Design an enzyme around this catalytic site. Structure first.
Site, mmCIF file in Angstrom:
data_model
loop_
_atom_site.group_PDB
_atom_site.id
_atom_site.type_symbol
_atom_site.label_atom_id
_atom_site.label_comp_id
_atom_site.label_asym_id
_atom_site.label_seq_id
_atom_site.Cartn_x
_atom_site.Cartn_y
_atom_site.Cartn_z
ATOM 1 N N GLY A 36 0.819 -1.189 0.000
ATOM 2 C CA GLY A 36 0.000 0.000 0.000
ATOM 3 C C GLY A 36 0.853 1.240 0.000
ATOM 4 O O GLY A 36 2.055 1.188 0.243
ATOM 5 N N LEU A 37 0.208 2.360 -0.286
ATOM 6 C CA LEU A 37 0.885 3.637 -0.383
ATOM 7 C C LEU A 37 1.575 3.991 0.908
ATOM 8 O O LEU A 37 1.387 3.338 1.936
ATOM 9 C CB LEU A 37 -0.115 4.745 -0.709
ATOM 10 C CG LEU A 37 -0.963 4.589 -1.960
ATOM 11 C CD1 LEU A 37 -2.085 5.603 -1.887
ATOM 12 C CD2 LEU A 37 -0.092 4.769 -3.197
ATOM 13 N N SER A 38 2.369 5.050 0.849
ATOM 14 C CA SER A 38 2.939 5.605 2.058
ATOM 15 C C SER A 38 1.800 6.188 2.872
ATOM 16 O O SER A 38 0.953 6.908 2.344
ATOM 17 C CB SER A 38 3.971 6.690 1.726
ATOM 18 O OG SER A 38 4.947 6.768 2.752
ATOM 19 N N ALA A 39 1.766 5.849 4.154
ATOM 20 C CA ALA A 39 0.781 6.410 5.070
ATOM 21 C C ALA A 39 -0.590 5.786 4.839
ATOM 22 O O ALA A 39 -1.614 6.358 5.203
ATOM 23 C CB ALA A 39 0.715 7.932 4.922
ATOM 24 N N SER A 40 -0.601 4.624 4.193
ATOM 25 C CA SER A 40 -1.821 3.832 4.064
ATOM 26 C C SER A 40 -2.062 3.116 5.385
ATOM 27 O O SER A 40 -3.179 2.729 5.703
ATOM 28 C CB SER A 40 -1.692 2.831 2.918
ATOM 29 O OG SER A 40 -0.549 2.017 3.096
ATOM 30 N N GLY A 41 -0.988 2.924 6.144
ATOM 31 C CA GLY A 41 -1.078 2.411 7.504
ATOM 32 C C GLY A 41 -0.659 0.964 7.679
ATOM 33 O O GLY A 41 -1.133 0.261 8.574
ATOM 34 N N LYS A 42 0.238 0.514 6.816
ATOM 35 C CA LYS A 42 0.755 -0.846 6.892
ATOM 36 C C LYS A 42 1.368 -1.115 8.252
ATOM 37 O O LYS A 42 1.084 -2.127 8.895
ATOM 38 C CB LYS A 42 1.820 -1.063 5.810
ATOM 39 C CG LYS A 42 1.381 -0.656 4.432
ATOM 40 C CD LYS A 42 2.442 -1.011 3.407
ATOM 41 C CE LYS A 42 3.621 -0.040 3.488
ATOM 42 N NZ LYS A 42 3.156 1.381 3.333
ATOM 43 N N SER A 43 2.219 -0.197 8.696
ATOM 44 C CA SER A 43 3.025 -0.455 9.895
ATOM 45 C C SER A 43 2.164 -0.360 11.149
ATOM 46 O O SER A 43 2.418 -1.026 12.150
ATOM 47 C CB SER A 43 4.272 0.443 9.949
ATOM 48 O OG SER A 43 4.100 1.535 10.843
ATOM 49 N N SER A 92 6.254 -1.787 -1.402
ATOM 50 C CA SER A 92 6.365 -2.788 -2.473
ATOM 51 C C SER A 92 5.403 -2.498 -3.620
ATOM 52 O O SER A 92 4.492 -3.289 -3.886
ATOM 53 C CB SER A 92 6.178 -4.214 -1.940
ATOM 54 O OG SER A 92 5.061 -4.292 -1.074
HETATM 55 N N1 LIG Z 1 -7.235 2.199 10.165
HETATM 56 C C1 LIG Z 1 -6.708 3.434 10.432
HETATM 57 N N2 LIG Z 1 -7.476 4.479 10.866
HETATM 58 C C2 LIG Z 1 -6.970 5.706 11.135
HETATM 59 N N3 LIG Z 1 -5.665 5.995 10.994
HETATM 60 C C3 LIG Z 1 -4.788 5.042 10.569
HETATM 61 C C4 LIG Z 1 -5.251 3.682 10.254
HETATM 62 N N4 LIG Z 1 -4.151 2.984 9.861
HETATM 63 C C5 LIG Z 1 -3.081 3.826 9.922
HETATM 64 N N5 LIG Z 1 -3.476 5.042 10.340
HETATM 65 C C6 LIG Z 1 -2.641 6.237 10.545
HETATM 66 O O1 LIG Z 1 -2.032 6.628 9.319
HETATM 67 C C7 LIG Z 1 -0.737 7.151 9.613
HETATM 68 C C8 LIG Z 1 0.331 6.501 8.745
HETATM 69 O O2 LIG Z 1 0.255 5.084 8.835
HETATM 70 P P1 LIG Z 1 1.547 4.123 8.950
HETATM 71 O O3 LIG Z 1 1.070 2.819 9.582
HETATM 72 O O4 LIG Z 1 2.716 4.911 9.517
HETATM 73 O O5 LIG Z 1 1.753 3.974 7.343
HETATM 74 P P2 LIG Z 1 2.710 3.059 6.391
HETATM 75 O O6 LIG Z 1 1.674 2.208 5.680
HETATM 76 O O7 LIG Z 1 3.332 4.138 5.536
HETATM 77 O O8 LIG Z 1 3.724 2.262 7.199
HETATM 78 C C9 LIG Z 1 -0.444 6.879 11.075
HETATM 79 O O9 LIG Z 1 -0.563 8.113 11.770
HETATM 80 C C10 LIG Z 1 -1.526 5.931 11.521
HETATM 81 O O10 LIG Z 1 -1.936 6.096 12.887
HETATM 82 CL CL LIG Z 2 9.097 -0.790 -1.137
#
Ligand SMILES: Nc1ncnc2c1ncn2[C@@H]1O[C@H](COP(=O)(O)OP(=O)(O)O)[C@@H](O)[C@H]1O
Ligand SMILES: [Cl-]
Ligand SMILES: Nc1ncnc2c1ncn2[C@@H]1O[C@H](COP(=O)(O)OS(=O)(=O)O)[C@@H](OP(=O)(O)O)[C@H]1O
Ligand SMILES: Nc1ncnc2c1ncn2[C@@H]1O[C@H](COP(=O)(O)OP(=O)(O)O)[C@@H](O)[C@H]1O
Ligand SMILES: [Cl-]
Lengths: 179, 181
Positions: free
Chosen positions: B9-16, B84
Site C-alpha cells: 500500500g501507499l505511504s501512510a496507508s497504515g501498513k506499519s 512494495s
Molecule cells: N485504520 C486506520 N485508521 C486511522 N488511521 C490510521 C489507520 N491505519 C493507519 N493510520 C494512521 O495513518 C498514519 C500513517 O500510517 P503508517 O502505519 O505509519 O503507514 P505506512 O503504511 O506508511 O507504514 C499513522 O498516523 C496511523 O496512525
Molecule cells: Cl518498497
C-alpha cells in the site's frame, strides 16, 4: 531469550549434524524455539547469487550474520552452520550481535583435514585433490581457525551427543537456558 | 507451520500501524510467534548494500521475501511492511513462498485513496514529494500498482485500526492458519 550459535568448520567436520542435534536436544529438554540456518535454507534462497569466491564468501557470511541477528532478536536461538572460514567475517558477525546485547556463541567444530577427508560424504575432497573443484576450503583455500571460541568441539571419534552436550553445558555455564 | 503476511500500500496507508497491531493480537490472543520485517529492521542491516537502482529495488524486495519465508519456515508468522509498489516485485515474493507443499503467502492490500494518504502524511513526505524535494515517490512521481486480487483487501480508512486487523485475522481463521482461542 535469544542468541546466535555460530558453528564454523571444514566441510565434513559435522556441523549440520551438530546443528540438527543441538536443536532437537534444546527443544526436547528446555523446549525453546530454535531455528537453524545452513546450505539448504540459505544458499538456494537468499544467497543464491553467491558462489565460493572470496568476496562471495564474505557476502554469504555478511548476509547470514544479519538474518541470524534477526532471529535472535525475535527471541529465537539462531543456529548457523556454514564453513565461514574467514576469521575477519566471523569476528564482524560477532560485533553486529554484541553492540543492548545479544550473545554470540562461536563453536569451533574441529576436525583435522584428514578426518574430514576420510569422510568425504559427497566426494568434494577427492575432486578438490584432482582440481575439479577450485578454491576448496582446507585443500586449495584457507581455513582460518577460531582463536577464542566459546566452545571448541573436537568432533572426531566422538558421539554427536557428547558434542551437543558440550555446547548445551556451556550455554547454561553462562545462563542462556531454562531449567 | 507458519506463513507470511505481506502488506502492500501507499505511504501512510497504515501498513506499519496494522503490522504492529497484528503481531500484538496474534502473539497475544493466539499464543503464536510473529515477527516484523520493515525498513528499520532490514534497510540498514541485511540490505544496507542496496541502493535505488531498479535492480537494487528488485533485489531489496527479493531478499525481504526470502527471509520472510525463513521465518515462515521456522514456524513464526512473518509480517512485512513495505510499500512494495511494483506488482512484479510481489510476484517474486509470492512465488518463492510457494515452493512437500509450500508456505502461505497472504498478500494484504492496505487500500487508501491517495488523497487520504496525503491528508495523513505523518512525516511530511507527500509534501516534500509534491515539492520535488524527494524524488520518485509512490503516488506522486512514481506509480503504485495495486494488487489485482489480494488475499485480503483492506480499505484502511473510515475503519478503526483494530477492525482492519480483525479483517486480516478473520481471513487467517478462514484458512485454519491460526490456532483457536
Ligand atoms: N485504520 C486506520 N485508521 C486511522 N488511521 C490510521 C489507520 N491505519 C493507519 N493510520 C494512521 O495513518 C498514519 C500513517 O500510517 P503508517 O502505519 O505509519 O503507514 P505506512 O503504511 O506508511 O507504514 C499513522 O498516523 C496511523 O496512525
Ligand atoms: Cl518498497
Ligand atoms: N569451492 C568450494 N570450497 C568449499 N566448499 C564447497 C565449494 N563448492 C561447493 N561446496 C559445498 O558447499 C558447502 C560449504 O558451503 P558454505 O556456505 O558453508 O561456504 S562458506 O561458509 O562461504 O566458507 C560444503 O559442504 P555441504 O554444502 O554440507 O555439502 C560443500 O559441499
Ligand atoms: N562425531 C562424529 N563421528 C564420526 N562421524 C561423524 C560425526 N559427526 C558427523 N559425522 C559424519 O560426518 C559426515 C559429514 O558431516 P556433516 O554434518 O554433513 O558435515 P558439515 O555439515 O560440517 O559439512 C556425515 O556423513 C556424518 O555422518
Ligand atoms: Cl565431476
Amino acid at each position: 531469550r535469544g542468541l546466535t550459535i555460530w558453528l564454523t568448520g571444514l566441510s565434513a567436520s559435522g556441523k549440520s549434524t551438530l546443528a540438527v542435534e543441538l536443536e532437537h536436544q534444546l527443544v526436547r529438554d528446555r523446549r525453546v524455539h530454535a531455528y537453524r540456518l545452513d546450505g539448504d535454507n540459505i544458499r538456494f534462497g537468499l544467497n543464491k547469487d553467491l558462489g565460493f569466491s572470496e568476496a562471495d564468501r564474505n557476502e554469504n557470511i555478511r548476509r547470514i550474520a544479519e538474518v541470524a541477528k534477526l532471529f535472535a532478536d525475535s527471541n529465537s536461538i539462531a543456529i548457523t552452520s556454514f564453513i565461514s572460514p574467514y576469521r575477519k567475517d566471523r569476528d564482524t558477525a560477532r560485533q553486529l550481535h554484541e553492540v543492548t546485547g545479544l550473545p554470540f556463541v562461536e563453536v569451533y567444530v574441529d576436525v583435522p583435514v584428514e578426518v574430514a577427508e576420510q569422510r568425504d560424504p559427497k566426494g568434494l575432497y577427492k575432486k578438490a585433490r584432482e582440481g575439479v573443484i577450485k578454491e576448496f576450503t582446507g585443500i586449495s583455500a584457507p581455513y582460518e581457525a577460531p582463536a577464542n571460541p566459546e566452545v571448541h568441539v573436537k568432533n572426531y571419534e566422538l558421539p554427536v551427543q557428547d558434542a551437543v552436550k558440550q555446547i548445551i553445558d556451556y550455554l547454561d555455564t553462562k545462563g542462556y537456558l531454562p531449567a
